[PDB]
């Protein structure tokens, strides 16, 4: 079935992180693509993604990068989908650079950043899911069901 | 008409910043209703908030607060809708506190967030408007108006 | 008999950090209860115990989490009881995204923000320990005959 | 009537953030004292305040520095009460460097530390308040008006 | 005569800074021009500006930009020219989102990074000045005549 | 061949980070030297290292230096010609001392600085032949094979 | 009489911090000159004047700088002089930068720092007056009065 | 022979750290005591350590703590002579917490204070040394020799 979201990254060491998105989405039952695009070697496929991907029928892009990490802000730029942008971990500065790179967008061309790491990849395909679950009932009932189920499996007292 | 959208910050002194979500909402005549709801002080209110915005016709949840800023992560704790998080400026931190008490969200709940500020409140609303553009086309189409005319309106060079 | 101290905490894996709190309670003799309590997927389950606590019997609660750490805020948000918080070491932001989101908290509901990790987690027993000996005498003795003890076992000099 | 908690800062520049601990201990008619007890210029006039602050009928001590701001630390070396610490914003580094001089105490000497700034000496007094309401039942009612009052009167929606 | 060095800026607001560039370039009477081009609002222009700067007799680019600071890394990816960037102070977070955003770039696509804000701005002109200045003996020796005024000029002590 | 290029370097613990720049200025085949200069053990080196740098042929210095990172800007305080700083990765602070003493050079005297590490190693002797191509047609023509080759060898997804 | 302190700085601008430093060395009659010396813009100036410190009879050196601040650094390179170096605050990064680029000095070559501000430059000045009590009896007494005067003004209430 | 320099420490742990000072102090000749001494468990050890130094015949005293470092400056508020602080290491937040409770020294009571870990305790051990030898000729000539032969033994080029 046809992508309706679309997970991009700058690099292959990207992909430890980003792999909990592409996981999720799969979980939920929602058609998706998975690329590398990497904002500063490969700027011209970067503008072509973004500006084609509504009429292939992208409806939500989840980008993640590490470092100077232009790739969500640039996706943004190109496109007039909704933008989850994901900071990954850098060596040096464990993301903070990451992070200020992607969440601190000027106003007019948005970026929804979540956390640093593997919990911001999780939460962009569970942000991504929200989205789509407005016009989309069924996924709208599978969603209802795992945060539920989530909600239900949480244990009352640590292990001691 | 009926609010799609809601805006909640968490004292008067963050409307200096969360109108700007707002002008921007009025601007693409999207219908939403802008209250005042506080973690800390009007837990209860937020609960009960959070909880029925769905029923009530809410589609995306914009909010706004600074300092250990709590507010969109409990908002989104009890609701399956998109919420949106804006870290407020805060006096001592400028805001560092309130990105990443927002930001930080563990893997199962996302806030989608935007920058410390203004510019975060205008993306806030920017970002719920691509988010309802997916099924709504007159929508769409003002968006994409808006977009253009952003772009187009950039001088080439600057008033010296 | 009755628990007068509640530990409550994000995850299993934040009981590596809150175990020292338990541990110092055991040590002066006083009773306690220690739960896991999720602000973010169990926020029900959070407002009730925060709320039925001093009904219950507590005197004061001690909090942990990491990162978006808004369990001891949210806690005191629903309880006029004493709240203690340690923010619990993160992978990323080693624990100041933690720190930040629990001591930053707006005028009007406190949370007593011990160290980050172990250290503030061992404090928090001994802070809860000196609350409640300004009404229980023979806590007040134990705790004196503690602090003195922990004086007079520092060594003069290191080894060399 | 005799004190019950001790307001002590730093510098006539503190009572600028001070004031807030001084004027909540007033409106819920706590009896205290407030005064000036500096770490580096008086530090002998600390350890006697200290030290002889529980035999005084002290049962809290609220703490104010900025800086390198060691009043607390040293203040709850010298005590068995519990000691609150309120970081003072410093003027270059904005109470960052009064934050953790403050809250990074080493295991086995707590000082439970609020905000930076205003809010921070407001929440102070809260908490020491919060700690005397378990054994002193009419400012315990106080307490929960006081608590009310600041739930009932947030208001619905910003003044635009 | 024809333009060797390209100002470029994301904003009015960013010339308040980089007309210290502008200045200094003409000041050393190095051929310039003064555009703003904006990374997310005008990303195709930005896109053919550095492409075709090479053909159009462009020897360096000089990028400024604030917060979430793509401009210099984006124009980096489209041109074989050096490219200098210049993190503008944002209001905030004082130009460390720019800095990290900016300096951080991935092996593979370089930006020379100044300081945040004028004197990086200033530093800018004077870095293109150095690396012009390799190959075009009149300007080399108005660049050393510069620098020697701006060592001679500094005075012994300091007005009181 | 005489060198063109000079690599300095604090320590013989900075080779590591700055063997990267070494690599790929031989890749270009663009001559150089490669030493050890300590701006604070031997300072008169230093001073006479960058003074006669011009003089020698040489027409970029690449300086990599951590912690207290003097030894980018003190060349440039010697030297017309260009200097391009590599911040170290330093223990303690993760190369955030690095790269603030050598990027936040005051008004009048350039430091090109780039990434913390490895990648700022790289992207400095990038920069380096990005300057020297624009006088260098031969080496011009390979740069711009080596950046389409770059662009070129980027996969299309991730190894999934 | 001949100086034994010097107090150098590296602007104009940096007087408004450093003149604290030279009103306590006069206040307790120390015989000092003040002097304006740039580590980049006068680097002979700087060698010459370290060098030839301690045979013109000066005992300690007191550097003042912002930004990337080098002066004290280089300053101690070539001295066996004490060096004291007082981080001036910079206008974004409010003398973090100052700190860091002054106080992390490699093993071999200290630079004693002091606080960030006028707070810094006063107490270099009382460092080097320690430094020299240690050998001069008159001056010994005049800073223990100094020190008693400063410790028995302090109020003990703060005027409300 | 009797101790002219006091190195102290707040823990069995920094000795790690400290012990560079020591070994520095021997190698140069000077004659020294080592003693742990704990700010928070032995204030008043603390006390009688720092007043009673200078009539022991201590002319330096070199301090060194983590975390919330209270023991430099503490200790330099009861003595008038000159107290060196270096900022041991710690866990989560690197010695930054170390650093900035070390140096933000309010003005009126100085700490000299060097780099985050090892490599500031072995400067604290070489700027004591610089401060004993203004008054010490046979020590100055060996320090003399020292920093000489340091210059003299640089490596001309890295192991490539």
Same mark, same amino acid.
């Given at each position: 079935?046809? +992508?309706?979201?679309?997970?991009?990254? /700058?690099?292959? %060491?990207? *992909?430890?992180?980003?792999?909990?998105?592409?996981?999720?989405?799969?979980?939920?039952? #929602?058609?998706?693509?998975?690329?590398?695009?990497?904002?500063?070697?490969? !700027? $011209? =496929?970067?503008?072509?993604?973004?500006?084609?991907?509504?009429?292939? /029928?992208?409806?939500?892009?989840?980008? /993640?990068?590490?470092?100077?990490?232009?790739? !969500?802000?640039?996706?943004?730029? *190109?496109? =007039?989908?909704? @933008?989850? &942008?994901? +900071?990954?971990?850098? =060596?040096?500065?464990? &993301?903070? $650079?990451?992070?200020?790179? #992607?969440?601190?967008?000027?106003?007019? @061309? !948005? @970026? &929804?950043?979540?956390?640093?790491?593997?919990? &911001?990849?999780?939460?962009?395909?569970?942000?991504?899911?929200?989205?789509?679950?407005?016009?989309?009932?069924?996924?709208?009932?599978?969603?209802?069901? *795992?945060?539920?189920?989530?909600?239900?499996? @949480? +244990?009352? %007292? !640590?292990?001691?």
């Amino acid at each position: 079935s046809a +992508p309706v979201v679309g997970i991009i990254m /700058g690099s292959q %060491s990207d *992909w430890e992180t980003m792999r909990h998105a592409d996981a999720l989405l799969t979980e939920l039952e #929602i058609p998706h693509e998975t690329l590398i695009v990497v904002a500063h070697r490969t !700027p $011209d =496929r970067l503008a072509d993604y973004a500006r084609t991907a509504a009429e292939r /029928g992208l409806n939500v892009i989840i980008a /993640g990068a590490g470092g100077a990490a232009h790739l !969500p802000g640039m996706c943004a730029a *190109w496109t =007039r989908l909704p @933008v989850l &942008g994901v +900071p990954v971990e850098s =060596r040096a500065l464990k &993301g903070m $650079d990451s992070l200020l790179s #992607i969440v601190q967008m000027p106003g007019g @061309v !948005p @970026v &929804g950043t979540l956390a640093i790491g593997a919990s &911001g990849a999780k939460n962009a395909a569970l942000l991504a899911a929200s989205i789509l679950a407005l016009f989309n009932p069924a996924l709208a009932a599978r969603l209802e069901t *795992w945060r539920a189920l989530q909600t239900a499996s @949480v +244990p009352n %007292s !640590p292990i001691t």
